């Protein structure tokens, strides 16, 4: 279990992943700020925007990513943004006593329950897998380097960067959870659950209590507003 090049590849993913943190001035707003729908929405907005900064930073350092066509690199970034961002938020909800105040801000932010409800099911669903940091990081690379996104010119080039990340992730599922032989398969299933938010997202973008807000620049650009 563990291959020299696979360790090298993992160490490289982790160097990059651990750099990615939610800034404390943002989390302080969760505790400090006035409680209403507008101010709550503004908070989530800042956090979403930060999701993108971090994931652009991660995407950039991914092994092989600079060797891809400049168009294709953008197609993968915009392609994976929604999936990637929800995943990161789930990591930052499951892994203090602030989850509670954040949840309450989320549920009193003018977003209707048809979106909020499966956000939280997903968080529970992924939280039951008890994933290590290393599993999260590889999953995130696996999502980001999906060959199945809209507009990719050279899909096979993307495939050949994704495949080794799946091989490593599978070994990590044996290493971290040997008790649970169906654990890797179970992570692939949560990716199925994760892809459903591409439709939940496209709808919200449309919705009146989501379209009549002016999203930060990075947001308008990544989400094709």
């Amino acid at each position: 279990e563990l291959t020299p090049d696979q360790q090298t590849l993992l160490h490289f993913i982790m160097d990059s992943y651990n750099k990615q943190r939610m800034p404390q001035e943002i989390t302080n707003k969760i505790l400090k700020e006035e409680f209403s729908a507008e101010e709550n929405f503004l908070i989530l907005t800042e956090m979403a925007t930060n999701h993108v900064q971090v994931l652009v930073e991660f995407t950039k350092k991914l092994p092989g990513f600079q060797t891809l066509d400049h168009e294709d690199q953008i197609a993968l970034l915009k392609g994976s943004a929604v999936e990637a961002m929800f995943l990161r938020s789930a990591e930052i909800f499951n892994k203090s006593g602030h989850s509670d105040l954040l949840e309450e801000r989320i549920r009193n932010s003018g977003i209707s329950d048809e979106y909020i409800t499966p956000m939280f099911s997903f968080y529970k669903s992924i939280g039951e897998l008890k994933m290590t940091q290393e599993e999260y990081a590889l999953l995130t690379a696996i999502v980001i380097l999906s060959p199945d996104r809209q507009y990719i010119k050279d899909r096979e080039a993307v495939e050949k960067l994704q495949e080794p990340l799946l091989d490593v992730l599978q070994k990590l599922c044996k290493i971290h959870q040997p008790e649970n032989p169906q654990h890797f398969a179970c992570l692939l299933g949560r990716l199925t659950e994760l892809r459903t938010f591409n439709h939940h997202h496209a709808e919200m973008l449309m919705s009146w209590r989501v379209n009549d807000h002016k999203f930060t620049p990075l947001l308008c650009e990544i989400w094709d507003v």
């Binding site: 652009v56 953008i74 620049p217």
Partner: peptide
């Protein structure tokens, strides 16, 4: 197109 995302990728 995508000047912002291009800037952020090349830094």
């Amino acid at each position: 197109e995508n000047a912002l995302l291009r800037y952020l990728l090349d830094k």
